[PDB]
């Protein structure tokens, strides 16, 4: 398998939000004995973690800043970041944060320039400057590009230059819908089979450098690339989940507490509902979906922050007591007392 | 189990078709040696099936015409029918059809008239003209009503009479979705199990006493409901088909022809497409979508009458023949000759 | 008239599906008396056939690739690959395909290279690599792009330029909707009357160079401008096709043969009831519209590949054959034959 | 020809209006030569004029009133009536509406009770309490019935002895569309030819009695009973107008006002635009289509009453001016006026 | 406070249009004492204004035509054109014209060439051709753009260099909306408080050398950023309207007639109803709802060349008569005139 990574990426916004580390790439690093991965951010650490413990052959890392200027910090040492991070990472982080900070007042952002600690060609990767070259028989093409509004500019440049059945993934940047939309391939003169490509994600919670774990979504890929990819990702990210592309999103670090919170709920409702009511699923489902849509109508209707003068938080509570048991009676509780504080 | 038919139905319009006969019918006749069965017609042939073949314990016939004008012709014999069914019903049904229609002249239209050939009480059923005690205790209620709108008022006299769990059955005149709207039962104010009933259909293609068959909805009843109900209709009617409630309309007398065209089409360019090109389910179904919902769309814009203006048939000859192969080259040489007959 | 060709194509496609050759492009240059025309292909069949049969008395052609590696194959006889496709193309296009895809498999791809046989200014064309200059007083400027989405930024660059009520046609790459949305021009500030373009399109079914007709996408240009295109299109390719811009991609040949199935079961069907049961349109097109709209929406809901898990084929039956009169009976029999070998 | 009036109305709410008079019943009074017509109002007056002026052999009036307490005030003089209306009618009108005023405080409302002047009888109608026998053999049969949610059930009680191809006529008190669900016919199990039905509307501004003219809705009749039913109003009404039965509702006497001021805009500013500008008319209908559908929403999203403090009034003024040439000449002035005394 | 202008703008449609002048540009010369204000257009005009007149400290202007041919017409003297636009512009505006059609014949379009006659360095503007530095440190960022479609590809080289809660303004050639989406950061991986950005409108009604006033766009913006904004305007422009964001088409110089017109009927249709009838203004809102509606619909469905043949001018006439009261009785003369002209 030949991995093409689009997109190195840049240290500077990771250091900048204050409150990331390294601690995932440390403990690739001391699985399989290679220091250097201990620094690496980004997905110069997702393809180390690929080609260090999930087989894949052959990296090679495209992206503009390689003529101009890619910057390697040299001023920590692997060792002591790998320690650092068995106990305590900010034994450390907080020199790394000031020093990337520093650097990035004058280096250009990337494409011109970029920040990292690891150079991928340490790493047994080839490096080039040319999106069209690296995708040349690439099996996965893993694209990491800002906002997706610039997408199709440097996606059409080598679009046909992928192997047909390529897995490509797409950054958090793009919605799934759009970034497959660059690729579709709809009417045709000549009835020639179709050059289908596998459109998903491969993408991490916060960042790779710090957490495993890896996204991947499904609706615009075969069922064999998206196993094919979950197993990867199981192997290389330490997990992996499946899930509906349009859920993306709403699983990121800024939405997920909210669809958390949300599904805990439609899942204790339903399980109240079926196991100890003794009503069949779809009697869930259908209270469910009228309560979700209404409630989500309310908000968009008044705003969020209005909610409270046309809907009393009180006003919830008599009934809702009618439903703790079963499931929902965990998390009634907490609910109850929230509205309650919130009551007019 | 208990059914209760609610509507016995009247055979004026079957014999004015000038197109039915008695051939179900009497095939059940036979098969369980009650020749009374064979000038059953409607749901009284159902109901017989279902006694006779498929263990039916009780069977009770409500419907207001048991008090008014019911009328049992008794000009024909159940052995001649039978006999002349056996090669030519061509024999006798010209002399039923012409009395039925003499009859019919002067005959109230039901509910105050209704005309039938052999008592339902004489095949065991009870009958009444209550509904309410007719769907009391009942497991299957077949209900065999007039137009959709009128079924509100009846059915809302009995609804709660009904048993927990029955199924119920709506004639055609009603689409599932409607008539599963008047059983709905949404919000409440005491938690208790809700009395859940199975909405469905035991809908026979043409008249049921002229052919087996049976069409069971899905969408609206349990699993166990429609496989019970499937089971049952196998046994009484010859065969059965579960199919989701929205395809009834599509496949009734009136419409099958052009579902049957269309589907035969998607599915033999799907099977070109996977099989003979090689490319994904997903593939095909992309160009189907924009194509049905396309030329759907034409027909809706200018009228079914004016498509051939806007889209001249023979504008599509050249470009269909790229798929000649494969399943599609069963159904193209036909599509050809009519479209080369139409273009302009 | 003068006509702007934006983008001269590459042959290498063409080749590369091993099914096309030069059947249409040796008529024209027979026809003409000029054997150079019988291997040109894409846009440069349909300027030679627009300037030689249809009075275009201006051509320019318009590509980046004339300043990088446009590439003339001279290895064949024009007058050859005219004898060969008076019986058997096949007699020659072998070599042809192979000489391309060997020449293919090291020339850049189109806009840094292509693949022609007979150079456009050897037809009397001027040749320019400025889009804008090339559109300059064009009263016809046909666009021959990539994939939509990086049509907005070529369009862009000459959009200015276009000659006032000029027809600017697109390629198939990009749905007509998408194009004039490039082009329309909404909101001002000023009241002066708008330049108004003509969109529309002059596309070929298969490649031009093998066969004739054209298709002219209706719904974003005056009445005038389509009958000018029509009546060049019926002098320069032989037949045209005048039709609703939103049917396009229905009918290319990816999908035509779905479309075509399709429409020849709406029209069958509308003529046995308008014509032996005596209904009016309008009763074909309500029971029509549920039909196609339901067995679209199974199809989006279960999959294409999953419809008959839902919908047996074989309960459409025993209802299809109750409007078997009339047109409909040509088409039934194939369509009963394929339910019948598909029925669970 | 046979006409079916049901519903005979009650002269209460005109009288309690303090606003119509009998002008149209007394000039069809004076045409005829029968003055008995002068004080008919509502269907009666409409029965009359058809058959008197339109040719139509037989009328028949149904309503349960005329077996409950139809009321015949006889304290008028045909003639003085048409002597009042000759040029003053408010010499007369005020003695009527006291007299139904009093007659109607104690008078039950219909179908209980009915006011009337001239029993039809004396105009030559049948008169019946029984519907289903009035609609026998009617080829025109106009209802007049309550609000439109009690119209399925009187109307099911005569569906189907209605004479196929009748056209049959709705009041305002129910859209097209949903009278038009009354009697659709969609799904059957016999393919005869369905007893299609032609609805319409016959419904004149303000009351019948008062004014001349009617209002004949499109779209769910065949084109050969509009125009037979056109031809009948304008002999019988005075006037008639044809009209998508989407637009009954708009032009009646409460909403007319604003759909006029609305349309007198299109029409002026579409002309301006292509009469004076030069522009294509669908250049007018695009910025037409913005123009008007988001001055909608905004009401929709503020309410009417909030509109000014969104959209100042004020903030038209200046780019209004703009097109002010040609036809939208003639309506700015009062609307800058208008405008200019709103501003904030 | 500091004020990037992004696009200068070129006068060569405005001086082409034959009817634009300097009188606002002229006045604004005047107030402050700085003659060469007088010849300024577009983006320099409000610049000139913001910097002289709404106490902006710092002002640049960036556009790729001042490395290209930026070209500073110096035949005109400033005081010459003042003192015409104190009584008639028409003394010198055709000769401005005639030079700047003369220089528009050769002068490339922009961003290669630009028509300017003050440039802006002489008004204490910076100038650059970097939009990048341009923006640093910017809080308003005013940008002039062509075409929508063209804009992301400018706005993503510099957006990200944009600081925190600046307002940013896009010009008409883009919906707000999509100018919105090109800005709109949803999704991340960090929680980090959003650098939200305050996208809004700052858009003069026809050119603002001719014309004070401003247009500024809500739902995009926190209400600090548009009350920063509109009293900037009243200071800068003369006068300021803020309005919602899709009102911003309709408000235009091509549209405003229309809008105008419908919403003086609106609110004169609204006032009668509540006034005089004394109904809530939610009747009124529900009926003018519907009328709205439909007529628009109508327009869509048959064209708006063809409402006539579908809805007959007459048929308003009778109807609309009967809301002839109130705010209603100033304006329905007018339309009564043109329907009664526009009659069949
Ligand atoms: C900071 C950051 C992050 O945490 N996550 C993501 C993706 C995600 O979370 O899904 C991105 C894109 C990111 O931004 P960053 O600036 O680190 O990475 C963008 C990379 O994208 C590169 N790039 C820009 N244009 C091109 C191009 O045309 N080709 C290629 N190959 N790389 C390109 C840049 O130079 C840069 O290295
Ligand atoms: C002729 C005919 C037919 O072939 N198929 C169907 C149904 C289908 O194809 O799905 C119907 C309803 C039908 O009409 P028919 O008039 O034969 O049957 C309607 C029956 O419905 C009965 N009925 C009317 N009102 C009531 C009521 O309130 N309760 C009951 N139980 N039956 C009622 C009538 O008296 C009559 O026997
Ligand atoms: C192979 C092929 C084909 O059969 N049909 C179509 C259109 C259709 O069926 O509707 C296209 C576009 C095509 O692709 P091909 O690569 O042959 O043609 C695209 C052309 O488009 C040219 N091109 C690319 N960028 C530009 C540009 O900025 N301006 C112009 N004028 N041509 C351009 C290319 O160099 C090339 O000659
Ligand atoms: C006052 C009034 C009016 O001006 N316009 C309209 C219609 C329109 O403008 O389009 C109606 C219905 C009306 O109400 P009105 O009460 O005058 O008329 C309703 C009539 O409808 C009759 N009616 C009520 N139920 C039935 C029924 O079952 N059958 C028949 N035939 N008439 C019925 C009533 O007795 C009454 O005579
Ligand atoms: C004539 C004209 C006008 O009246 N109004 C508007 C806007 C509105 O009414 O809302 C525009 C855009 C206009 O077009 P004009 O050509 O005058 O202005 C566009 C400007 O936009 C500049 N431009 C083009 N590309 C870029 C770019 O990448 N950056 C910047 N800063 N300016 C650019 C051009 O050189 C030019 O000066
Ligand atoms: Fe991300
Ligand atoms: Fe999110
Ligand atoms: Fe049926
Ligand atoms: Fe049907
Ligand atoms: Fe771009
Ligand atoms: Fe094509
Ligand atoms: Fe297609
Ligand atoms: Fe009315
Ligand atoms: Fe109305
Ligand atoms: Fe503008
Ligand atoms: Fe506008």
């Known amino acids: 398998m030949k991995l093409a990574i689009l997109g190195a990426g840049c240290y500077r916004t990771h250091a900048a939000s204050g409150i990331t580390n390294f601690s995932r790439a440390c403990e690739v690093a001391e699985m399989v004995g290679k220091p250097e991965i201990a620094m690496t951010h980004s997905t110069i650490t997702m393809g180390a973690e690929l080609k260090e413990l999930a087989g894949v052959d052959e990296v090679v890392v495209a992206d503009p800043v390689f003529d101009n200027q890619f910057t390697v910090i040299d001023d920590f040492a692997y060792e002591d970041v790998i320690e650092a991070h068995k106990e305590d990472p900010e034994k450390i982080m907080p020199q790394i944060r000031e020093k990337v900070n520093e650097v990035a007042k004058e280096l250009p952002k990337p494409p011109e320039g970029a ?62 819908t759009k970034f497959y939309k660059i690729f579709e391939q709809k009417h045709g003169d000549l009835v020639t089979k179709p050059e289908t490509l596998n459109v998903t994600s491969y993408h991490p919670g916060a960042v790779p450098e710090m957490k495993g774990q890896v996204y991947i979504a499904e609706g615009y890929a075969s069922e064999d690339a998206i196993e094919t990819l979950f197993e990867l990702g199981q192997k290389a ?108």
């Open 115 to 176: 920040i990292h600690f690891t150079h991928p060609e340490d790493l047994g990767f080839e490096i080039t400057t040319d999106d069209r070259e690296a995708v040349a028989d690439a099996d996965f093409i893993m694209t990491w590009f800002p906002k997706g509004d610039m997408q199709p500019d440097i996606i059409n440049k080598f679009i046909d230059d992928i192997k047909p059945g390529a897995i490509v993934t797409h950054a958090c940047t793009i919605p799934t």
């Open 237 to 344: 990210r330490g997990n992996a989940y499946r899930l509906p592309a349009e859920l993306l999103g709403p699983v990121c670090d800024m939405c997920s507490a909210l669809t958390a919170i949300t599904y805990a709920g439609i899942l204790s409702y339903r399980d109240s509902v079926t196991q100890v009511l003794g009503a069949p699923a779809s009697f869930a489902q259908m209270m469910a979906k009228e309560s979700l849509e209404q409630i989500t109508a309310l908000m968009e209707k008044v705003g969020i922050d209005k909610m409270e003068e046309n809907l009393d938080p009180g006003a919830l509570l008599g009934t809702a007591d009618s439903m703790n048991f079963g499931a929902s009676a965990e998390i009634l509780p907490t609910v109850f007392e929230i509205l309650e504080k919130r009551k007019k």
